[PDB]
Amino acid sequence: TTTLAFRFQGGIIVAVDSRATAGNWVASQTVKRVIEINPFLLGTMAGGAADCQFWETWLGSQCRLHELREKERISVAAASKILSNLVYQYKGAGLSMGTMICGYTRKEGPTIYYVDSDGTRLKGDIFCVGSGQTFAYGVLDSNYKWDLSVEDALYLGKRSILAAAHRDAYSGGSVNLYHVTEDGWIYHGNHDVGELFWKVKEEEGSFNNVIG
């Protein structure tokens, strides 16, 4: 699995792969690794599927409750901490999760919080998580600029997942992209890695060693 999220001029880019494996068995090539918390917040799934899926869908509920009570949109800082604090309550029981809580609020701007089952909660600009993280970080770090366009940004994220899907045996299937803006997130499609690899190869000239 490879999931990433990065902050820039026009919001946040969230890109993830969609493979799930049980040992060497590829259980699914169509896993949804971005949990649509609500129309303004996104969370990435890494670690235990149920754990992430369950607690982030729960997070969505706690976020809706807050807004009903306070009549104001929940900040990413507060939404992340709800999950982070819950996860810390169960510390040692065995939950497994590495997730990015992404949002763009008026008060904070584009915000990403890395939250894991160890109880760590970190605010940052770029985060990759999963078995393929190292591969994604290579592409990201060398091409990331704060002034990227929403088109190039979407491309960088998509390419980073591809770098990982190629090399990491546990990542692949397809890439799911999302752009997070203040008025909410906009989904930028599901791209099959089979077809995306070849396109990128011919247009970019990369992956020279692969014959095709």
Partner: protein, 198 residues
């Protein structure tokens, strides 16, 4: 473990704390501030187990902030540290112990003296001129033992921490990505933004 150093000079306490957060195979962040202001004249740095570290520090801050308001007063650094020690000493025989080591640097407005307290995860508190947690002391204490003087200026302290950080960067195996340094004195707590090269 992260790097946490503190040095009490004549009129202030300087805490230097590493900037990296490493999770497994990758360095996740290179700008982490491992410190919480407990009161306007008391700062605590911390190092330890992943989530426990911040959870503990934020719990202490909340508790000290509450006292200040109920009482309209700022506890002495010695009082804050004793409170911190008792909390750590409680968890040691708890269901799941906090594994956090802290350094508390505070300026006592009443005695008019800066003070540094070192307390490990077990609740072992000791007041010192300089201190550290984990392996940090292993490389730096020889330097501190040699060059330290009680009447040092803030600049002399900073120069010494720099030497300490240089030895750490030369012989210590992990890249801790530099340190964030903070000074605690009569005027409060300020972050020295000039340490990457001084």
């Amino acid at each position: 473990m992260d790097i946490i150093l503190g040095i009490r000079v004549q009129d202030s306490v300087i805490l230097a704390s590493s900037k990296a957060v490493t999770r497994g195979i990758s360095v996740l962040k290179d700008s982490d501030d491992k410190t919480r202001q407990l009161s306007p004249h008391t700062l605590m740095s911390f190092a330890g187990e992943a989530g426990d570290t911040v959870q503990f520090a934020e719990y202490i801050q909340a508790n000290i902030q509450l006292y200040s308001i109920r009482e309209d007063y700022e506890l002495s650094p010695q009082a804050v540290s004793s409170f911190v020690r008792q909390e750590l000493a409680k968890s040691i025989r708890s269901r799941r112990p906090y594994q956090v080591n802290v350094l508390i640097g505070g300026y006592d407005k009443k005695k008019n003296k800066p003070e540094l307290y070192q307390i490990d995860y077990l609740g072992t508190k000791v007041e010192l001129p300089y201190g550290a947690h984990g392996y940090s002391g292993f490389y730096t204490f020889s330097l501190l033992d040699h060059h330290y003087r009680p009447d040092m200026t803030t600049e002399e302290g900073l120069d010494l921490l720099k030497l300490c950080v240089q030895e750490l960067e030369k012989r210590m195996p992990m890249d801790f990505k530099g340190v964030i340094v903070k000074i605690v004195d009569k005027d409060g707590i300020r972050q020295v933004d000039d340490f990457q090269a001084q």
